[PDB]
């Protein structure tokens, strides 16, 4: 039940750092991976009696200690171009990235699958990120692949071409991942904004994320009973192969208060269309300080599509070890049809630019024609339409 984690790109490794940070403190390991005095060998790697190293590969990193034999320094070239990352520049390094990964699973008794932390708006995390997602499937067909993908939002964007990279990558996340957590900047923004009087900075957003990760990953690295393995994540949240795009929330930012906050619109990390959107599959996980009781109480709060059975469709878990800084916290993974919003948004943006030949050429001269791009959009459009009609 070992999970290899792959972080790619600036945003990819930025999350890596932050997450693996508390990743240790939670499991109580030192800056170097020792006991400063549970089944954790799922994320960390036991080297010797009391030594552990993070089961993770840092791909395309450009600035603490991970196995620098399993981390690849970035080679200039990706830019903000997806096509550039998935081809010209990715090619030069995909074979290597892959060996570095495979050599990390070699020292893996029973591999479960992978986790990928990256940004779908850049060029490294999107382009190269997609290429990896692809060759990762074509190599470990039986393994599960999960994603922590940051979606871009104009209210904190640095590239004009983002939505293009967004759509392109979303296609590969759709065709190769068993599930993806969409960390929406538009949401991460708003959250951080009203949480800290001044205009947010990538770090602030980066925080919310780090927590969301640890909390989502928790159940996989702790003794609990809910979402023991990525596989359970699937059977519990993906009501169908294609629709595997989830949202996650955090609480907080009492218990009735926690369970209330955990399932509070404003508390989620995604712009889901809470109005004409309906639930499909939920999952709460509280950790810290009588849970298998208020379950039915909550399900009456949430409104799933009609065809779903009244009671059930929602499972609640627990972990005694809460994230540092809290006595006990929440987290809610929800496969909600409102997630269609996020896609539709990206589409709309895409369309304007694309229909005017916005920056289309930088992509074509890089091995990504407008038709290929259009296909990418048309596909993601359907994916969203899909979620929409399911409501």
């Amino acid at each position: 039940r070992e999970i290899l984690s792959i972080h790619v790109g600036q945003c990819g490794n930025q999350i890596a750092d932050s997450f693996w940070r508390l990743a240790l403190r939670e499991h109580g390991l030192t800056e170097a991976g020792t006991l400063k005095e549970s089944n954790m060998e799922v994320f960390f790697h036991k080297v010797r009696d009391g030594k552990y190293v993070p089961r993770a590969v840092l791909v395309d990193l450009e600035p603490q200690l991970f196995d620098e034999s399993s981390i690849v320094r970035k080679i200039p070239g990706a830019a903000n171009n997806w096509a550039r990352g998935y081809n010209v520049e990715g090619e030069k390094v995909i074979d290597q990235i892959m060996n570095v990964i495979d050599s990390a699973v070699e020292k893996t008794k029973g591999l479960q699958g992978f986790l990928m932390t990256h940004s779908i708006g850049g060029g490294s995390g999107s382009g190269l990120g997609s290429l990896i997602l692809e060759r990762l499937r074509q190599a470990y067909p039986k393994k599960r692949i999960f994603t922590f993908s940051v979606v871009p939002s104009p209210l904190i964007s640095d590239s004009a071409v983002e939505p293009y990279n967004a759509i392109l990558t979303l296609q590969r996340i759709l065709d190769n991942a068993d599930g993806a957590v969409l960390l929406d900047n538009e949401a991460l923004f708003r959250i951080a904004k009203a949480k800290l009087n001044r205009s947010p900075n990538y770090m602030d957003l980066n925080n919310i994320i780090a927590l969301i990760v640890s909390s989502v990953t928790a159940s996989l690295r702790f003794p609990g009973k809910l979402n023991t393995d990525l596989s359970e994540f699937v059977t519990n949240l993906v009501p169908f192969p294609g629709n595997h795009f989830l949202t996650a929330s955090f609480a907080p930012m009492n218990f009735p208060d926690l369970a209330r906050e955990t399932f509070a619109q404003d508390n989620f990390t995604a712009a889901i269309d809470w109005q004409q959107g309906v639930y499909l599959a939920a999952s709460a996980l509280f950790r810290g300080d009588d849970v298998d009781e208020n379950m039915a109480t909550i399900r009456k709060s949430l409104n799933y599509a009609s065809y779903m059975p009244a009671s059930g469709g929602l499972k609640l878990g627990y972990a005694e070890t809460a994230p540092e800084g809290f006595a006990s916290s929440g987290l809610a993974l929800v496969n909600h049809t409102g997630i269609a919003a996020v896609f539709e948004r990206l589409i709309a943006q895409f369309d304007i630019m694309f229909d005017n030949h916005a920056y289309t050429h930088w992509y074509e001269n890089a091995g990504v024609s407008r038709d290929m791009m259009a296909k990418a959009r048309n596909q993601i459009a359907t994916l969203a339409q899909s979620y929409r009609d399911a409501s």
Partner: protein
């Protein structure tokens, strides 16, 4: 590991600007601009690997610009050699004797056809000793014969042999208050066609604007081309700073990154730039500087960006660190007053570099792809016509390789470029169709 940048400076103006640029950058990085040496035992400030090359291995080691200087007349290169000490690589200072007689034709297909070989040999060399080449900046004055002629020639062969490499042209446009040949509009229009078709982006330096500026904001009774040239450097230095020095969250912004953001369409890659602070070489506050960057009298181009549309902007600060909050806050406000298009809703790059230049503790450069550039290009086309209409001096060019048909087409291209941008104000979809 960082991207490499080679700077080929063609012509006279190009080379004079280039010389200044290199001395300045040398000083920013802590390298003696006459010996290529820095303090023993330590390496130059910032990412010197970017524009400089390491020679030797100890500390007696020197650093040498990734630059090539080409010119059909010795007057300037010869002087650079005199004034630059052992700075540059001697075999990278290509020069000739007869000159080009202010003839695009001569430089494009004739006398310049002879230097191409040596010049290319040098590129191949500088291109190879690059861990990661990531852009070639051609610095030249599109108004004369060599810079316009060889300029175009060199950019075209540079995109045929190589081509996976981005090429940013920094073209100095000619003006009345400094003209040197009645045919400046011929040469320019001719070189424009190539700039338009073979470069990845052209940063335009309009001398008229430089003159006014050096005379108004710097208030110089009668500005010399040297005065004008200093401003061009302040910018080149300030633009390239994002490559030579490290940021807060990024270590370097690539010419590629920078360009893929500013250039939405192939024939819409003609950039403008503004600077601040513009204080005569004889202090202002962040807020004022940001505000002034967008004044109509601060762009190094004879136009009014504010009366046009911004297709894509890029503000590049340096010196700004602690005061960042306030700085963003201001530029943020500015961003609202800016005229944008409907088809490129958002495109506003912002970059910070801790290290300041040798001139101001805090400064900033505006790099913008604005439509009022179409106005500048028109002015050129007009004058081109005042001459071509009466066929003045045509013979010099005709009897040197060119033809009437060839000349007309070039003028035609220049037109397409101009209309293309105008349309762009309204629609990108249309601006496209105008490209044929």
């Amino acid at each position: 590991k960082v991207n490499n940048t080679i700077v080929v400076s063609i012509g006279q103006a190009g080379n004079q600007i280039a010389a200044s640029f290199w001395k300045t950058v040398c000083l920013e990085h802590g390298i003696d601009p006459l010996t290529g040496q820095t303090a023993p035992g330590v390496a130059p400030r910032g990412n010197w690997s970017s524009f400089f090359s390491k020679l030797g291995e100890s500390s007696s080691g020197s650093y040498v610009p990734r630059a090539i200087m080409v010119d059909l007349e010795p007057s300037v290169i010869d002087n650079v050699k005199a004034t630059s000490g052992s700075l540059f690589n001697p075999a990278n200072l290509i020069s000739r004797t007869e000159g080009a007689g202010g003839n695009f034709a001569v430089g494009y297909l004739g006398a310049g056809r002879e230097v191409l070989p040596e010049v290319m040999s040098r590129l191949d060399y500088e291109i190879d000793k690059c861990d990661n080449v990531g852009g070639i900046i051609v610095l030249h004055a599109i108004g004369g014969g060599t810079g316009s002629g060889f300029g175009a020639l060199l950019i075209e062969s540079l995109k045929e042999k190589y081509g996976e490499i981005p090429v940013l042209s920094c073209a100095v446009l000619p003006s009345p208050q400094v003209s040197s040949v009645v045919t400046e509009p011929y040469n320019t229009v001719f070189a424009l066609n190539t700039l338009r078709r073979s470069a990845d982006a052209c940063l335009i330096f309009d001398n008229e604007a430089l003159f006014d500026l050096a005379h108004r904001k710097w208030n110089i009774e009668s500005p010399t081309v040297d005065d004008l040239n200093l401003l061009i450097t302040e910018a080149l230095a300030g633009i390239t700073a994002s490559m030579r020095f490290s940021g807060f969250l990024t270590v370097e912004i690539s010419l590629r990154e920078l360009l893929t953001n500013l250039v939405p369409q192939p024939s819409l890659h003609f950039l403008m730039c503004a600077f601040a602070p513009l204080t005569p070489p004889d202090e202002l506050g962040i807020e004022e500087m940001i505000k002034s960057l967008f004044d109509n009298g601060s762009v190094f181009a004879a136009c009014s960006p504010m009366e046009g549309r911004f297709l894509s902007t890029a503000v590049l600060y340096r010196g700004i660190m602690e005061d960042k909050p306030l700085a963003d806050a201001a530029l943020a406000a500015m961003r609202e007053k800016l005229p944008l298009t409907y088809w490129i809703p958002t495109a506003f790059k912002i970059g910070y570099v801790e290290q300041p230049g040798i001139s101001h503790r805090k400064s900033m450069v505006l790099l913008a792809n604005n439509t009022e550039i179409a106005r500048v290009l028109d002015r050129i086309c007009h004058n081109f016509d005042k001459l071509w209409q009466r066929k003045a001096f045509a013979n010099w060019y005709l009897n040197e390789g060119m033809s009437e048909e060839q000349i007309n087409v070039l003028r035609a291209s220049a037109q397409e470029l101009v209309q293309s941008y105008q349309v762009a104000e309204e629609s990108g979809a249309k601006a496209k169709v105008q490209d044929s």
